[PDB]
Symmetry: D2
């Protein structure tokens, strides 16, 4: 059952790279998680003010998963759908889907989970309110 | 801490492989990036299939497609720590196989991370599922 | 600062391609890792050869082997900065081609890095050098 | 002209990974520079006391190059030869070569150059003496 574009709120284009393709010629399964990491964090920096260089609070990835429906290959143009399934105190569950640009049905769809912690000590903390506001803005309307 | 799932132990896995860490395994927060673990899963599984199951990745008529995967991360590791992957097969079907994997520090019992993934085996050119080849089945059966 | 070589300028390159940065482009010191630049060179060149020169990477009988490369790094960039690669062909021979590339911030004139690499074109199966195919030559000639 | 094993002083085995192979089936050219980065830094940490997590001094890569003589593929076992061509005040030139384990003639050979700087400001500084001692120990005897 394949996610559709209209089921996500925010989109990030990601350009494909030569070595995204593996030996069998399609984007390797691993690379999809790099797209997930890149899509989520691009948004938290651009919209939630996240300071990756010097911020006191960082997101740890505690879990992730992906289902792969149909392949894509460098150099096809792809775009990530991003939404938030649940925003908790200090953790957040994201759902994502990769689409060919100019296509309705996702090639792959996944999820991952951030827990926000103090940079040095890794103690869980309140999502800075700026980040909270941006995360809530991605709230899934799916079903 | 991180994932709250029950942490698997070394003795739950049947085969082990060391994987050296690389400089850029670490990301900007200083530990091995979450994505990298899936590259360890891919490496551990295919190393085995080739060396023990005879898989021919260069000219073989049959290939593994990864159709789902997942991982829980319990505690960080960092380059240049030496790591090792535990592998077992949780199920072995006609055309598909589910692996369980965990990363351990070399010289240690509790998993830093654990996850799974599914291969479906298909004809190289057409991508029509075929049955897992006999020699590869035999090798996978030894991990179940 | 870093490399002391003369910094190339945008107008020295003939074709440009934006490449989005990815989370793990940054390494533990916080900027895009030196290795990543070569992945940008590979991407910029092959994107062009496919889109403009008709190269068929999936089923083509002729492939590019990278036989040498180099890079000078003048100043850092960091994910999520938007970057772009300038490309020109410095020489175009019968079977080999030398590219010059530089990375720029999108919206900027001075190169953050610059380097080169050489393709030799070979028969896919045997790796015997063949001449660069006519359609690919024509595209490369437009960058020289 | 292909470097031989006996022309290097220190060796690091590096295990190959699935996605090291690209679409044409051999380790991608880019990956060799990751091997260079990994070999040099493994040694500076293990033998020169480098503190990558919290050290005040970091190495910047200002230049690199590689010549590729013959291919290798996952899952072949490979090993990096490492030597120092010239140790300067604040910079150092490394030469490296990739060998198949159990083979004399290098598949590829390269060089790269570190400039050591203050972590925050990137001002060039004296190589901490511990690092200096380890770097001198790799001095090339080649010719």
């Amino acid at each position: 059952p394949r996610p559709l574009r209209e089921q996500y709120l925010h989109f990030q284009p990601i350009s494909t790279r030569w070595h995204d393709n593996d030996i069998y010629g399609h984007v390797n399964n691993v690379t999809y998680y790099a797209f997930f990491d890149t899509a989520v964090n691009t948004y938290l920096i651009e919209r939630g003010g996240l300071d990756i260089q010097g911020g006191e609070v960082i997101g740890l990835v505690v879990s992730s998963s992906c289902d792969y429906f149909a392949p894509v290959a460098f150099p096809q143009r792809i775009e990530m759908g991003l939404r938030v399934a649940r925003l908790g105190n200090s953790s957040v569950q994201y759902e994502l889907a990769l689409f060919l640009e100019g296509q309705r049905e996702a090639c792959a769809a996944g999820r991952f989970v951030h827990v926000f912690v103090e940079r040095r000590s890794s103690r869980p903390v309140a999502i800075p309110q700026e980040l909270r506001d941006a995360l809530a803005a991605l709230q899934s309307s799916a079903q």
